[PDB]
């Protein structure tokens, strides 16, 4: 029935609202110009990053990293820091997808281990336009041009994310669309090392129906939006592997030692 | 509110199950006999020790050298290596404590630096009785009388931990209880060198509330269990200073030792 599916959508949308403070609708308002006053600090070069570093830390010692370092490395350390933060919120949201917490604990951990990245890059798209990305819970805004100009390995780092966001943001999805999408990702029965594949696919199967009904109702004028959205999941799988490859060059060719015990061991045997 | 507090307990218990392979329930299964996979090998003297290592026929050891040193020192190498894994386990668990990864980064490190030893002893109690301790994932069992008999410096290393364990275990706490108690330890605002005390105390306070309710509901006949458990926090703190004092003696009585890089940071200027 339709009402069951719609009830599952409403249910997901409210968890997602509990789990993620900066939503797409809020982020989009900020990126445009809703009630222009609390404007984010715009970082567009090195000087304005240093000037900004002391306006998201000059308050009271809470940045995404301290100093005594090269700027291209510090930006990258701040991003790994935020990712660990975002893994916690994704885990919290997962627990509220019906059926998830009744899976075998190891399969829970595996699902999260490979889902988290695709979700991070999906949701990061809500903070981006073609020119930059909202940072620090929407406090800052770092321009795509500035990220591009960092040195050889750090420059080409966030570009692929921006290439994705633009094509994905053109689907015009909202938070209620994304909440299901995100849940269809977590319950991917094709992750390596999964013990019980059948029950996961039973869940995804019921989320797919929910997604499909959601898109058909919320976006009737968009022929085959469901299909296009499932195809975007190849693009995500792609950006993850390509990010994974770039990440396995950073720890390989660099001088900075300071990586999070969580990601560095969760990146282990990962595509 | 009592629902969030129960939600926090199940949350922490799951992260506990996920981070620590040898739980209290399992350890007490191996100690009890209520298991289905051979009783552990008892080590009580030099010959049973010899054999317990020489038990390499269908039973393995963890990646490093073999009999490289003296007996007393080879146990010392054994525990050291296990510490490093405990630390990694504890770190993994820490990142899942609501509000921990949002903390200033230096603060995070400080909390882990001082909290780890306390958690290592609390959880080492789970594998103890008055007679000895499970070693190497509970495949082995080394007697307290054995550990007492070692050469001067080394024979006083685990005796303090034993005395604590017998009283702690009398509290009859379970894994669901330990999970919140451990979180309370890590989020301590009196660790030297912290930069944002208040946000740490706020979390502890909420964890304190959680633990109280967990104890009331899980041990309703146990009068003042909460107080009795917080009191054990001073016993633990004494174990650590004691342990760190024994390290000093090892610098004077031993030749080349030198600790694992990770452990050496955690001990650095530690009281
Ligand atoms: O915290 S410990 O008590 N540490 C410890 C005990 C011992 C020895 C016992 C008997 C002879 S030596 N050594 N260590 C130890 C741990 C870490 C270090 F960096 C140095 C010593 C311990 C004991 C058993 C298992 C553990 F995981 C930790």
From Swiss-Prot, chains A, B:
One of its GO terms (molecular function) is DNA-binding transcription factor activity. There is a cross-link at residue 18 (Glycyl lysine isopeptide (Lys-Gly) (interchain with G-Cter in ubiquitin)). One of its GO terms (cellular component) is intracellular membrane-bounded organelle. The keyword Ubl conjugation applies. One of its GO terms (biological process) is negative regulation of mitochondrial fission. PDPK1 activates its transcriptional activity independently of its kinase activity. It comes from the Eukaryota. Highest expression in adipose tissue. Lower in skeletal muscle, spleen, heart and liver. Also detectable in placenta, lung and ovary. A motif (9aaTAD) lies at residues 261-269. Keywords: Activator, Biological rhythms, Cytoplasm, Diabetes mellitus, Disease variant, DNA-binding, Glycoprotein, Isopeptide bond, Metal-binding, Nucleus, Obesity, Phosphoprotein, Receptor, Transcription, Transcription regulation, Ubl conjugation, Zinc, Zinc-finger. It is found in: Nucleus; Cytoplasm. Phosphorylated in basal conditions and dephosphorylated when treated with the ligand. May be dephosphorylated by PPP5C. The 9aaTAD motif is a transactivation domain present in a large number of yeast and animal transcription factors. Belongs to the nuclear hormone receptor family. NR1 subfamily. This is Peroxisome proliferator-activated receptor gamma. The gene is PPARG. The chain holds residues 235 to 505 of 505 of the full protein.
